Amino acid sequence: AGGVEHQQLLDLAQKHLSSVSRVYEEDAVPGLTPCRFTGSEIRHRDDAL
Amino acid sequence: SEPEHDHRKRMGLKMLLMMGLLLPLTYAMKRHKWSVLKSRKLAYRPPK
Numbered sequence: 004a005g006g007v008e009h010q011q012l013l014d015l016a017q018k019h020l021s022s023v024s025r026v027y028e029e030d031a032v033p034g035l036t037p038c039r040f041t042g043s044e045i046r047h048r049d050d051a052l
Numbered sequence: 053s054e055p056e057h058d059h060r061k062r063m064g065l066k067m068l069l070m071m072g073l074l075l076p077l078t079y080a081m082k083r084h085k086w087s088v089l090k091s092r093k094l095a096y097r098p099p100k
Contacts, residue, residue, distance in 0.1 A: 054060075
């Protein structure tokens with residue numbers, strides 16, 4: 004963000020950040036799974052506060 | 053001696069059926085509103 008040329012940043016990213024990993028190395032994609040919501044209560048009680 | 057005998061027994065049969073319906077449902081309401089508390093777990097964090 005800011006006073007930067009997009010083509011200049013693309014040339015920099017092609018020069019430096021080329022070939023970061025690109026490979027899973029086990030063909031194991033870590034995929035996200037939906038999380039169960041739980042109606043619940045937690046009560047940490049410290050009366051000194 | 054008891055002219056109300058048959059009507060009393062009919063009303064008692066209705067009472068028995070209605071109570072046999074109502075008691076597990078009211079007990080279930082009690083178990084719900086108290087099962088918020090009967091599954092509760094307590095922990096202690098002494099600072100040592």
